[PDB]
Amino acid sequence: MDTADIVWVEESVSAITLYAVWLPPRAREYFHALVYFVCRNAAGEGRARFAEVSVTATELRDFYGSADVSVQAVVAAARAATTPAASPLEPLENPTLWRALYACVLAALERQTGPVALFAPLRIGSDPRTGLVVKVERASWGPPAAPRAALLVAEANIDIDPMALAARVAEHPDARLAWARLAAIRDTPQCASAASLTVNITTGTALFAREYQTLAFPPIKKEGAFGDLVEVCEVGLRPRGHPQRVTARVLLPRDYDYFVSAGEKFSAPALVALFRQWHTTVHAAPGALAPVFAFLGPEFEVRGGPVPYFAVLGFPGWPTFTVPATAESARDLVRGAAAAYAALLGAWPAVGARVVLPPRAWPGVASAAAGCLLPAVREAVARWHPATKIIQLLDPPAAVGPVWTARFCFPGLRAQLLAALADLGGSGLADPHGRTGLARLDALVVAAPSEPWAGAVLERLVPDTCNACPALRQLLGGVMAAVCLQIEETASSVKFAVCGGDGGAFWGVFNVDPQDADAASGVIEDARRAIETAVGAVLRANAVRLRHPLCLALEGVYTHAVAWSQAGVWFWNSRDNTDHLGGFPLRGPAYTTAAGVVRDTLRRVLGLTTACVPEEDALTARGLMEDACDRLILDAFNKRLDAEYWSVRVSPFEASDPLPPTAFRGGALLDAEHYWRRVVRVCPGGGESVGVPVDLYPRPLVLPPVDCAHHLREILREIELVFTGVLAGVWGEGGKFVYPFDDKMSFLFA
Amino acid sequence: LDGDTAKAYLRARTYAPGALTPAPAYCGAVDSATKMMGRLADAEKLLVPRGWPAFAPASPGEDTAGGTPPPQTCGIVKRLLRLAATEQQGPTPPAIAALIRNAAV
Numbered sequence A: 001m002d003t004a005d006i007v008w009v010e011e012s013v014s015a016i017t018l019y020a021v022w023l024p025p026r027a028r029e030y031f032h033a034l035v036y037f038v039c040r041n042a043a044g045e046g047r048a049r050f051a052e053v054s055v056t057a058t059e060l061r062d063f064y065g066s067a068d069v070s071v072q073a074v075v076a077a078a079r080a081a082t083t084p085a086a087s088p089l090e091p092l093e094n095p096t097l098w099r100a101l102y103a104c105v106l107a108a109l110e111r112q113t114g115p116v117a118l119f120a121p122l123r124i125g126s127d128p129r130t131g132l133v134v135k136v137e138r139a140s141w142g143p144p145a146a147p148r149a150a151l152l153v154a155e156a157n158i159d160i161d162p163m164a165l166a167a168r169v170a171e172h173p174d175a176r177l178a179w180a181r182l183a184a185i186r187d188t189p190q191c192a193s194a195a196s197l198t199v200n201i202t203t204g205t206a207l208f209a210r211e212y213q214t215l216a217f218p219p220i221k222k223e224g225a226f227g228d229l230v231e232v233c234e235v236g237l238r239p240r241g242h243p244q245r246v247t248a249r250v251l252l253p254r255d256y257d258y259f260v261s262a263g264e265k266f267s268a269p270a271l272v273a274l275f276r277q278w279h280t281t282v283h284a285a286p287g288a289l290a291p292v293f294a295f296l297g298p299e300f301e302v303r304g305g306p307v308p309y310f311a312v313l314g315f316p317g318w319p320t321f322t323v324p325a326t327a328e329s330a331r332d333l334v335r336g337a338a339a340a341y342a343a344l345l346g347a348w349p350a351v352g353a354r355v356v357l358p359p360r361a362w363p364g365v366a367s368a369a370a371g372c373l374l375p376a377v378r379e380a381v382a383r384w385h386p387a388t389k390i391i392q393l394l395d396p397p398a399a400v401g402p403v404w405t406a407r408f409c410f411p412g413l414r415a416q417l418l419a420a421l422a423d424l425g426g427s428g429l430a431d432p433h434g435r436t437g438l439a440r441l442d443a444l445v446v447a448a449p450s451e452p453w454a455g456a457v458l459e460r461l462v463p464d465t466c467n468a469c470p471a472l473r474q475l476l477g478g479v480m481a482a483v484c485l486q487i488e489e490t491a492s493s494v495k496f497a498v499c500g501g502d503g504g505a506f507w508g509v510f511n512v513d514p515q516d517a518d519a520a521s522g523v524i525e526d527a528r529r530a531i532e533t534a535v536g537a538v539l540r541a542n543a544v545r546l547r548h549p550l551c552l553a554l555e556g557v558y559t560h561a562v563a564w565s566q567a568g569v570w571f572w573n574s575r576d577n578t579d580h581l582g583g584f585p586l587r588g589p590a591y592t593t594a595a596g597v598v599r600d601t602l603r604r605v606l607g608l609t610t611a612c613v614p615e616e617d618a619l620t621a622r623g624l625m626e627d628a629c630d631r632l633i634l635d636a637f638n639k640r641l642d643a644e645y646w647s648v649r650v651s652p653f654e655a656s657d658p659l660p661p662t663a664f665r666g667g668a669l670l671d672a673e674h675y676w677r678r679v680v681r682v683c684p685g686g687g688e689s690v691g692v693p694v695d696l697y698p699r700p701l702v703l704p705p706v707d708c709a710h711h712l713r714e715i716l717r718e719i720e721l722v723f724t725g726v727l728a729g730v731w732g733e734g735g736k737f738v739y740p741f742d743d744k745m746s747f748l749f750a
Numbered sequence B: 001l002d003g004d005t006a007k008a009y010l011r012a013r014t015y016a017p018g019a020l021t022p023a024p025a026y027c028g029a030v031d032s033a034t035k036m037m038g039r040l041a042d043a044e045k046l047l048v049p050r051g052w053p054a055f056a057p058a059s060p061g062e063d064t065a066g067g068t069p070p071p072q073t074c075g076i077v078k079r080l081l082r083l084a085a086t087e088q089q090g091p092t093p094p095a096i097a098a099l100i101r102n103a104a105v
Helices: A057-064 A071-081 A095-112 A162-171 A177-187 A268-282 A330-343 A362-371 A375-383 A413-428 A432-447 A452-468 A470-491 A517-541 A590-611 A616-635 A661-665 A668-672 A708-731 B004-012 B033-050 B072-084
Strands: A007-022 A030-040 A046-056 A121-126 A133-137 A149-157 A196-202 A207-212 A221-223 A230-237 A246-253 A258-262 A320-323 A398-400 A405-409 A496-501 A505-510 A553-558 A560-563 A569-572 A579-582 A648-650 A677-682 A690-693
Touching (some): A007 A095, A030 A095, A057 A071, A071 A095, A095 A432, A149 A668, A162 A661, A177 A268, A196 A268, A320 A330, A330 A452, A362 A470, A452 A470, A470 A517, A560 A590, A569 A590, A590 A616, A590 A708, A616 A708
Antiparallel strands (some): A030 A046, A121 A133, A230 A246, A398 A560, A677 A690
């Protein structure tokens, strides 16, 4: 604490990692952790610095989200992870424990030492006698060193008995195959030592190539030196929680800050095996402490995750970004990944929603925010239910003919409202140090309009936050309902009539002569301005301070609209031929052709309606729809032999065909299944109609005839939904639209 | 049917143009019923690793009765017809080439 011996250095921090987690001499209420920073100077020079933090059981329980966690379990898991030769997949037991551990350690480090940011200039003050970083301040010593990347390509051949994978899958009916592979590798770690590996690392200064026939034997093909990528450093420390002096051995990268691996084929087991071999080799000579060996990803959960990532919490010490390939926009993808890593401190997506606030602190903030606002708003919030209708709208099937329609939108309203309401509830925060998460959220919200990566981060983060605290759902719903009520009240006076939407996005009709676009474009802008001003005033009157100012955006202007359900709607502009279709399922490459066909047919029918005719018009529309369906089915015959075109995507929360026993022999192909499973349907006999997981087999595939009749019926159901809605709305017809498939077209596939 | 659809249908639903054409000798899979079943099993074993669904047949006197007790002759005939009627995608030889054991079929 004494400032007479602190040595201050200007530097930048490239990554923060977890090194050791130990229980102090006699302490059953808290534990100590040793965090490791890989700092860099103004010209570029790796240095290794260490800080020590103390985490109590209360913070661990708060970040965990429950009360079934103990410091003893955390210490046991951390000590087990220190030996990857026997337990290389410790976070696979309880991923939430490690997420809570990382969040707690990061928060404690941020609060005790000071404001820590990655890739930003800082002044670090360390104690010469202890060797530990004691203070961090934010300064400005010019342009900090620019981050440097290093391309990585790892390919491993791990063999696991398909019987074990089948048994594990049978244990969990909805488990993903990547998790099954990881669990099987966990059960017998010796399978990772006998695998064959190939690693290629390309930095801006050197190259590193290795080919191991067996990971336990010397490489057969070698290029470059391990002393060129990373430098091994030994440091001495005297933590206050350690009775005697200790030593730490670390890997400092040279000429790079993080690894970047494309998305062509990323396998977690290959990287895990490579890093495990590195850990075994480096931490063999006695004398120092062994760092924890933990990783996280979407494959460490039974049901997977929708976003692929790879989080390093310990060894080696630097992050690894997985970026999908074959995009011409790969560079912007990598830039966005780096920006997200720097902005959110590297916790997201690993920790999850804990990067904002601990999951056991949301109820207090939500209650405090609800206590504020206005009486009517509070009554609306308390009564909110997901099935209540706030403002009266059009009832499908409906159709608005020649009018001046207009789609409006508030881009990012839920995120802005959450940021504003968390600030309102901040008085309910137990301590003023939780403000850092809300500041991070505010930065994300501010940067979202101009940075797409921030928009994606928020779109994935807000639902997680709502899931964490079910009391946030009602708080957001009530405010959205108030916003919709104000929107309706204001629009009732600018020649507007709202016909749909939920409050963040809506559309409506205008009361204006439908022939003068020049005079019609001047009313839409006035209505937009008035609506934006009214919504802003209503939000301000409730003390809700929107950090980023509101902005209503006109998404389009049309002349015809047809609604066939509560979510599906078709807008058409009869002067420019532009149109918009919403609510049509797209779960495969064959659902895009159907969408195009539907849009073209609807364009033709609604253009025919302009000429105008009696019910004869409805008959003509029916004929056109039947013709369109016929042509679609006829064109679908030339793609009868393609299996990836007819394959449909399935989520982990639906009923799917049982996995054929031959799908577990794929090998490295099962390491890429974490959320979606593509299944095609084939007919090997009379009426078998079995299902085939397309992506679990090597190519090319040898399959029986595809079951295009079943797939075409599934698509035709959706097509007929839209066509029936259009017929019922535009011409008032009770007669549903049905297409005879089994009578006129089923022969092409039988 | 009209256009390229007519040509595709005609090519995909009749014998190959060179099937019923005189050749110096025959290229096929001719054998008795039992040996034919054995060859079919071998070909199915060759084909399964690439997506082809397995057969899973029943048999009286087994340790699992189940259902579908058809005679071996009917089953072999249906499997042969299905294999012979399966077309080829691109330059890859059809599935019957796993039983006939010739890549030019």
